Amino acid sequence: KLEAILSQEVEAEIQALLQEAEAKAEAVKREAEEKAKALLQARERALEAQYRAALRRAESAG
Amino acid sequence: GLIKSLAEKEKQLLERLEAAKKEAEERVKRAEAEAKALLEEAEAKAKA
């Protein structure tokens, strides 16, 4: 039959789509974690700068 | 044959694509929501 052909045609597209769309929902979850990570790394860098500078200022004053 | 077999099957083959587009979008939206809220927490924290 012609109908036994057709059911294999949907079940084929509808797995490719759902693997593509779990390869976007994975990729985003990665890039966002590495984003979140880097936005606290940069937060680390700032704190040092502002404390190293500050201690020198208060020393020179005294 | 008879065209009523494949006529009323086509309108199920059509549903098999349709439910596919749904669960593609509705999954990638959640991840974007999880990213948005994650990078907001990373501000709330950084500023605190």
UniProtKB/Swiss-Prot annotation, chain A:
Domain of life, source organism: Bacteria
Function summary: Produces ATP from ADP in the presence of a proton gradient across the membrane.
UniProt family annotation: Belongs to the V-ATPase E subunit family.
UniProt name for this protein: V-type ATP synthase subunit E
Interval of the full protein contained in this chain: 3 to 64 of 188
